[PDB]
Design a protein around this motif. Structure first.
Motif, short mmCIF file in Angstrom:
data_model
loop_
_atom_site.label_atom_id
_atom_site.label_comp_id
_atom_site.label_asym_id
_atom_site.label_seq_id
_atom_site.Cartn_x
_atom_site.Cartn_y
_atom_site.Cartn_z
N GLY A 1 54.58 -0.83 -81.13
CA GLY A 1 53.54 0.10 -81.53
C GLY A 1 53.63 0.37 -83.01
N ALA A 2 53.11 1.51 -83.44
CA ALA A 2 53.16 1.83 -84.86
C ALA A 2 54.57 2.10 -85.36
CB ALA A 2 52.29 3.05 -85.15
N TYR A 3 55.50 2.51 -84.49
CA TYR A 3 56.80 2.95 -84.96
C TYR A 3 57.58 1.81 -85.60
CZ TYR A 3 55.81 7.17 -82.32
OH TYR A 3 55.24 8.30 -81.83
N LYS A 4 57.49 0.60 -85.04
CA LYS A 4 58.15 -0.54 -85.66
C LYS A 4 57.59 -0.83 -87.04
CE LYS A 4 61.31 -3.57 -85.56
NZ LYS A 4 62.69 -3.09 -85.81
N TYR A 5 56.27 -0.73 -87.20
CA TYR A 5 55.66 -0.95 -88.51
C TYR A 5 56.11 0.10 -89.51
CZ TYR A 5 52.65 -4.42 -86.44
OH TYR A 5 52.18 -5.53 -85.79
N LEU A 6 56.18 1.36 -89.08
CA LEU A 6 56.65 2.41 -89.96
C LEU A 6 58.11 2.19 -90.33
CD1 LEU A 6 54.83 5.32 -88.17
CD2 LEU A 6 54.44 4.59 -90.52
N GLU A 7 58.93 1.73 -89.38
CA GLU A 7 60.33 1.49 -89.69
C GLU A 7 60.48 0.40 -90.74
OE1 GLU A 7 62.85 -0.57 -86.92
OE2 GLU A 7 64.08 -0.79 -88.71
N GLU A 8 59.76 -0.72 -90.57
CA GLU A 8 59.89 -1.81 -91.53
C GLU A 8 59.35 -1.43 -92.90
OE1 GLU A 8 61.67 -4.42 -90.76
OE2 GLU A 8 61.83 -3.96 -88.63
N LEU A 9 58.20 -0.75 -92.93
CA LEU A 9 57.60 -0.34 -94.20
C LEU A 9 58.45 0.70 -94.92
CD1 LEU A 9 55.08 -0.69 -96.01
CD2 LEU A 9 54.04 1.22 -94.78
N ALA A 10 59.16 1.56 -94.18
CA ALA A 10 60.04 2.53 -94.81
C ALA A 10 61.19 1.87 -95.56
CB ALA A 10 60.59 3.51 -93.76
N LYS A 11 61.53 0.62 -95.22
CA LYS A 11 62.59 -0.10 -95.93
C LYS A 11 62.17 -0.56 -97.31
CE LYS A 11 64.22 -2.03 -91.58
NZ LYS A 11 64.52 -3.28 -90.84
N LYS A 12 60.87 -0.56 -97.61
CA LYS A 12 60.35 -1.10 -98.87
C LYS A 12 60.09 0.03 -99.87
CE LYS A 12 60.52 -4.50 -96.19
NZ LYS A 12 61.69 -5.40 -96.26
N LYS A 13 61.17 0.60 -100.37
CA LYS A 13 61.03 1.76 -101.24
C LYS A 13 60.65 1.39 -102.67
CE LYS A 13 63.88 4.76 -98.49
NZ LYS A 13 64.22 3.86 -97.36
N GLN A 14 60.68 0.12 -103.02
CA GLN A 14 60.28 -0.32 -104.35
C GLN A 14 58.87 -0.90 -104.39
OE1 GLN A 14 62.40 0.40 -106.71
NE2 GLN A 14 64.47 -0.38 -106.34
N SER A 15 58.18 -0.94 -103.26
CA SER A 15 56.84 -1.52 -103.26
C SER A 15 55.85 -0.59 -103.95
CB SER A 15 56.36 -1.81 -101.84
OG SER A 15 55.99 -0.61 -101.19
N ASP A 16 54.71 -1.16 -104.33
CA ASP A 16 53.71 -0.38 -105.04
C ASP A 16 53.23 0.79 -104.20
OD1 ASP A 16 53.72 -1.75 -107.46
OD2 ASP A 16 52.20 -3.18 -106.83
N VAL A 17 53.00 0.55 -102.91
CA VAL A 17 52.52 1.60 -102.02
C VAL A 17 53.52 2.75 -101.95
CG1 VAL A 17 51.90 2.14 -99.67
CG2 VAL A 17 51.08 0.04 -100.70
N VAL D 37 55.81 -8.44 -87.31
CA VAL D 37 55.71 -7.15 -87.99
C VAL D 37 56.13 -7.29 -89.44
CG1 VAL D 37 56.66 -4.82 -88.13
CG2 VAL D 37 55.94 -5.75 -85.91
N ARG D 38 57.22 -8.01 -89.70
CA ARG D 38 57.69 -8.15 -91.07
C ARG D 38 56.71 -8.93 -91.93
NH1 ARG D 38 64.04 -8.81 -89.23
NH2 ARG D 38 64.33 -6.55 -89.09
N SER D 39 56.01 -9.91 -91.37
CA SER D 39 55.02 -10.63 -92.15
C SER D 39 53.85 -9.72 -92.52
CB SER D 39 54.55 -11.87 -91.39
OG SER D 39 53.87 -11.50 -90.22
N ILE D 40 53.43 -8.86 -91.60
CA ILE D 40 52.40 -7.88 -91.92
C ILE D 40 52.88 -6.92 -93.01
CG2 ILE D 40 50.96 -6.06 -91.02
CD1 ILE D 40 50.09 -8.74 -90.11
N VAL D 41 54.10 -6.41 -92.87
CA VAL D 41 54.63 -5.46 -93.85
C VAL D 41 54.76 -6.11 -95.22
CG1 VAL D 41 56.72 -4.20 -94.48
CG2 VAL D 41 55.71 -3.91 -92.23
#
Ligand code: MG
Ligand code: MG
Ligand code: MG
Ligand code: ZN
Lengths: 200, 147, 93, 95
Positions: A1-17, D37-41
């Motif tokens: 669900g969304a939680y996996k996406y939030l977990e992976e995106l939270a790892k990218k603290k240097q990204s533009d977003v 998921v990682r490819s999307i991220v």
RNA sequence: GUGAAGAGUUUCU
């Protein structure tokens, strides 16, 4: 669900977003009180995995803590002792800034139990944390077997005794050879107690 | 007991045996064993030579179990076996020879001091010295190595 | 003093256990590695507060060091060390 | 496997058998859902600034410089070599 | 952080 996406995106603290969002939120946080209530977790995925649930009795608080070491609070840098103890400036507090965040929020919400806390932001002056708290008097908590344990009086101010996740880390609680000093005082007592048996 | 102690004999003797000149002061040459290189040197160098300084390699995190290897000599080998086994084989002629498992008696290496009687025997051991093996073979026995 | 740059002496090296010709030089101390355990220990000890943690020699005299001769066997590459009495002047050859 | 206490295959000889699968040892495997998921991220988030700098050195064939920078950024050389290989695949993926 | 000139794929005034 969304939680996996939030977990992976939270790892990218240097990204533009994440850099942009961090900048605006840190500015927003600096505008309100040092301790203030959060209507919801800013990191819902992080909050869930640390025990938070979206039900009545779970509370999120935000707090900023001054960064850096601990200047020795002695009058004019004067320590009155041997040179090994004359240091004033490059000293460090043994508890993490996250631990201080939990301590201060716990005092602020003295009817609640501190469950856990997580990092959310930082600038050169402050680190920002969100502290998860639970109301032990609320019926939704007291009838819930998964969080029931925290009602019992042994869990009073667990953050003040180093019993949260970050508290046990700062205490050096761990398994095996790297943590032999263990709970320090209890381990020290075991090694410094002279055992005099009835030899008969 | 206190009744037989020398303290009881010194009652009425003013200095309690510690002299009128030199007395029984608090630590007059320092505490513990301090001073072995300076004012206690004549004692340390006479009765504890080798005390000061370093010799040899350090070994970090020594664990003594892999080094465990107590030894038994040949002259004790037949004492490890029960009395009934000795009577059955020692000095007799038999088709089978007794097995002496030295490891179950608590030994890791068989050493060669002493002598063996002239009966065959099978010595089961982790280790054996060269001279121990030669004397076992001269007695008609063998060494079989185990883990 | 004056010491010849070459001398014929007993060679303790395993392949030349006899008198051979040697090239003579004066011994000089090497340059003090930072990786030696004693230096690693001293540096670790000196860190933090407490100031100077070990004695340091503030004086110097007796600048007549014993002269140490390094004798290199010409062909064998074998090197030997020989100690002479103290002196203020040294010259090879 | 001589059955001695010294040598290459030392130790008592017993009847060896296959140990069962421990699912905890599956950790580190890449599940297909996690890879998706990682490819999307990676699409949403970009590359970190040091990652762009390393890729630039890779694109200019400065292979030692990229290794020095990635190790300096990440700490160890082992993490650097994994990162440079990953960023090399990205560069060739675009080509 | 965001923009402009200049310097022998770059960061300096
Ligand atoms: Mg517990
Ligand atoms: Mg007196
Ligand atoms: Mg006197
Ligand atoms: Zn030679």
């Amino acid at each position: 669900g969304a939680y996996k996406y939030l977990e992976e995106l939270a790892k990218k603290k240097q990204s533009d977003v994440n850099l942009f969002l961090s900048r605006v939120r840190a500015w927003e946080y600096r505008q309100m009180n040092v301790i203030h209530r959060a209507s919801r977790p800013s990191r819902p995925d992080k909050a869930r995995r640390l025990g938070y649930k979206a039900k009545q009795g779970y509370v999120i608080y935000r707090i900023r803590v001054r960064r850096g070491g601990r200047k020795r609070p002695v009058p004019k840098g004067q320590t009155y002792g041997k040179p090994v103890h004359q240091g004033v400036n490059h000293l460090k507090y043994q508890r993490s800034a996250r631990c201080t965040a939990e301590e201060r929020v716990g005092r602020y919400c003295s009817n609640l139990r501190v469950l856990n806390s997580y990092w959310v932001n930082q600038d050169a002056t402050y680190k920002f944390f969100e502290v998860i708290l639970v109301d032990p008097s609320h019926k939704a908590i007291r009838r819930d077997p998964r969080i029931n344990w925290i009602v019992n009086p042994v869990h009073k101010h667990r953050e003040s005794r180093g019993l949260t996740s970050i508290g046990k880390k700062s205490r050096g609680i761990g398994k095996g050879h790297r943590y032999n000093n263990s709970p320090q005082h209890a381990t020290w007592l075991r090694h410094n107690t002279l055992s005099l048996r009835r030899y008969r | 007991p206190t009744h037989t102690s020398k303290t009881r004999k010194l009652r009425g003797h003013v200095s309690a045996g510690h002299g009128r000149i030199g007395k029984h002061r608090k630590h007059p040459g320092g505490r513990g064993k301090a001073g072995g290189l300076q004012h206690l040197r004549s004692h340390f160098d006479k009765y504890h030579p080798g005390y000061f300084g370093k010799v040899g390699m350090r070994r970090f995190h020594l664990m003594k179990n892999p080094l465990w290897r107590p030894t038994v000599n040949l002259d004790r080998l037949w004492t490890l076996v029960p009395n009934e086994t000795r009577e059955k084989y020692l000095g007799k002629n038999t088709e089978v020879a007794p097995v002496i498992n030295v490891l179950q008696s608590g030994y890791g290496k068989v050493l060669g001091k002493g002598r063996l009687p002239d009966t065959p025997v099978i010595i089961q051991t982790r280790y054996v010295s060269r001279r121990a093996e030669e004397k076992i073979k001269q007695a008609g026995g063998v060494v079989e190595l185990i883990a | 003093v004056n010491i010849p740059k070459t001398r014929k002496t007993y060679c303790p090296g395993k392949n030349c256990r006899k008198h051979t010709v040697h090239r003579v030089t004066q011994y000089k101390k090497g340059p003090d590695s930072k990786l030696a355990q004693g230096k690693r220990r001293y540096d670790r000890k000196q860190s933090g507060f407490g100031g100077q943690t070990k004695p340091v020699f503030h004086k110097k005299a007796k600048v007549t060091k014993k002269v140490v001769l390094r004798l290199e066997c010409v062909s064998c590459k074998y090197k030997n060390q020989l100690v002479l009495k103290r002196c203020k002047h040294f010259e090879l050859g | 496997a001589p059955g001695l206490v010294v040598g290459l295959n030392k130790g008592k000889t017993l009847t060896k058998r296959q140990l069962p699968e421990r699912p905890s040892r599956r950790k580190g495997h890449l599940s297909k859902r996690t890879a998706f998921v990682r490819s999307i991220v990676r699409e949403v988030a970009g590359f970190a600034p040091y990652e762009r700098r390393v890729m630039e050195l890779i694109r200019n064939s400065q292979d030692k410089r990229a290794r020095k920078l990635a190790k300096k950024r990440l700490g160890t050389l082992k993490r650097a070599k994994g990162k440079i290989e990953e960023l090399t695949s990205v560069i060739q993926s675009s080509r």
